[PDB]
Amino acid sequence: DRPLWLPGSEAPKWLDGSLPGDYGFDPLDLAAEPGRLNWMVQAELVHCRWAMLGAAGIFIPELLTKIGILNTPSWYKAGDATYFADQGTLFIVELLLMAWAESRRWADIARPGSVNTDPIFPNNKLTGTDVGYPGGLWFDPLGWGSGSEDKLKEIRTKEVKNGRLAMLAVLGAFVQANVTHVGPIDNLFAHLADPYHTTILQSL
Amino acid sequence: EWLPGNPRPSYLDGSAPGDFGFDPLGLGEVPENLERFKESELIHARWAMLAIPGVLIPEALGYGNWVSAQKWAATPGGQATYLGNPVPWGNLPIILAVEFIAIAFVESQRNGESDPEKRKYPGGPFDPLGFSKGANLEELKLKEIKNGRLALVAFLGFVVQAVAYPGTGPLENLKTHLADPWHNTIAHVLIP
Amino acid sequence: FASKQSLSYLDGTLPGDYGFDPLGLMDPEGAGGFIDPQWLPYAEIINGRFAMLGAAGAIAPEVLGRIGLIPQETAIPWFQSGVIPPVGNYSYWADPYTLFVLEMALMGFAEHRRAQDYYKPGSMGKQYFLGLEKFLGGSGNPAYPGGPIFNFLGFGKNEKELQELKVKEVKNGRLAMMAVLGYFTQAIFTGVGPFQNLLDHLADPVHNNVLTNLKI
Amino acid sequence: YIGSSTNLIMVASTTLMLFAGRFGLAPSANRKSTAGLKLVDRDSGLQTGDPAGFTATDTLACGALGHVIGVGIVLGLKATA
């Protein structure tokens, strides 16, 4: 009684549908391995969350600049721009901080509920009871979302499909920067100016 | 607890000083091999501990560094004029022979110690102050091994930095990192 | 299971055994000297491992130079590094004969020790080496010593995976032996590196083969 | 050179020698000739995939004899014609 991504299409046996967003869409038969499904769901969560973060960080500056509130440079040349700190130094700081963060995440994934305790101050005790959703004061301050059964399903579906939308949108933005030398919203303006003569087939 | 949540090895349960269940490659399966590795790690670390002040202090006062010592620091001639006021003492025939003979003698006398427990810790007839009994033994060993591991990694950093920058020292590197924190670090050589 | 007759002594227990022995060199009827059936598999494995090293190391510098990892002063072909001074020469920190003496010393230690372990299986772990005699007692088969140094990661813990690894080793070794022979012959005929030969056969396959290079 | 007369003579000689080898028109490893040139059968401990008994030894021998005859014919024709 669960809608499928394709009407009248039989869902894969392993794709039960209990997990949020499971619409029986696995054409490549990739997730049939017993040990791969958890890795797939965690990877999709991380991918969608970082993709939507990057989607905000890309779309908001260009939109604000074209409105007029801000006067920030574009994303596809920001790396080659004047900064107080050297680019390599910043990158090393980034990789170190992310090494700590993901190391914690990887330890959580491999060993369930093993790194919920803060070493320096053992009086924190993260509250998350599911892998990939640690919650806690640092990551879930207000406490929204956590409720009864079938309440988490709809909001997690919202999260995963919003992340999918943002991820495909950011792929589109990168493809734009590869094909046109201007921001995607300016391409929206161009598509609005002459819609029947401005599309993908026009200047492929 | 080098990584929380990871099972400890069966032989590495956390009884000896400095144990944190860290042996991913599995070289300590044999208890005697584990003892030999303990002795070797402690020796490497203790030598690094002894050497580190002797290479930071001269630069702190402004004497020399790795390239200066290895190329010309009165070492190949001049009859040891390096130490503030020139003192003759010895030269190439002496500072090239007595050191090697003394180190060979001490290594041979250490090799002639039967007890592995004394091999990992000399203990007896050595201590002038006799502070081994005064303080807790386990705490003293833990502090010694932790400072020794810090000294070992610090000395590896000294060697790598000296190789990366000829004719330089750790203290000037520290000054450069203090004065220009975001333009002189690992990045200048990771991304040249 | 392939190649020629099943010689009735190549039953199949050896890794890589396919009953290929047209000359009957491994017949155990008269089997003295270096034609002993316990010496030929070991010798095959040894020229094979050395050939794997040689093929990888003779093709690596030129590829790295083409990509750009190493300075182009060191991207010379394998025969222009000092093996054959009349063809080409490179200046290292020592003249090649001092290098040869040092190499012979180190390889003499290693190889005479390995030989003594082959001839006296339990030895090399009894007398006092400089502390390393504990890890240098080869377990069982001379060609597969193992231990905390020669197998320091722990592959082939079970028997079947070890059999697969042995078979893989034998095939890559035989392939590398043939590759090294090809390196030699192609160096003689073409006068350029094997990677350049590969690029030449790829650019114009019909006009850049052995039939064209008959004139040097 | 591929269509040249020398190439044709060499390929024809080698092919004819191999044909006379595989089919019982010439001596081979598994088919001995007697004093009367009769081609009796001989059993050799050589295993081959060819169902007619043609082995790699026969392939090498027939190819060698074919190259020899072809070279002789080519040189003779060049010298005369």
Ligand SMILES: CC(/C=C/C=C(C)/C=C/[C@@]12O[C@]1(C)C[C@@H](O)CC2(C)C)=C\C=C\C=C(C)\C=C\C=C(C)\C=C\[C@@]12O[C@]1(C)C[C@@H](O)CC2(C)C
């Ligand atoms: C060891 C070896 C190669 C070693 C190469 C090395 C170390 C290369 C080193 C260097 O290049 C570097 C890295 C860098 C350079 O700058 C310098 C040098 C120093 C040049 C090849 C062996 C190569 C060994 C070969 C090719 C052996 C071939 C054997 C065959 C074909 C046997 C066939 C049969 O024996 C059977 C199987 C069954 C029998 O019954 C019948 C017959 C037919 C007899």
Ligand SMILES: CC1=C(/C=C/C(C)=C/C=C/C(C)=C/C=C/C=C(C)/C=C/C=C(C)/C=C/C2=C(C)CCCC2(C)C)C(C)(C)CCC1
């Ligand atoms: C597998 C297969 C097959 C086959 C194929 C083929 C193609 C074959 C061929 C083969 C061949 C084709 C072979 C050949 C060989 C040859 C040879 C072996 C030769 C040699 C030569 C020589 C020996 C010479 C010498 C000399 C002289 C005498 C003169 C002078 C000079 C010199 C010295 C050089 C069959 C059909 C069965 C099936 C299918 C697949």
Ligand SMILES: CCCCCCCCCCCCO[C@H]1O[C@H](CO)[C@@H](O[C@H]2O[C@H](CO)[C@@H](O)[C@H](O)[C@H]2O)[C@H](O)[C@H]1O
């Ligand atoms: C049995 C031996 C098996 C293994 C053989 C290994 C290959 C040995 C032959 C190498 C063939 C390459 O040799 C070919 O290139 C060499 C380098 O460009 C040339 O060498 C020439 O040029 C070099 C570089 O300018 C000069 O240093 C030489 O003095 C000069 O002779 C040879 O004149 C040429 O014949």
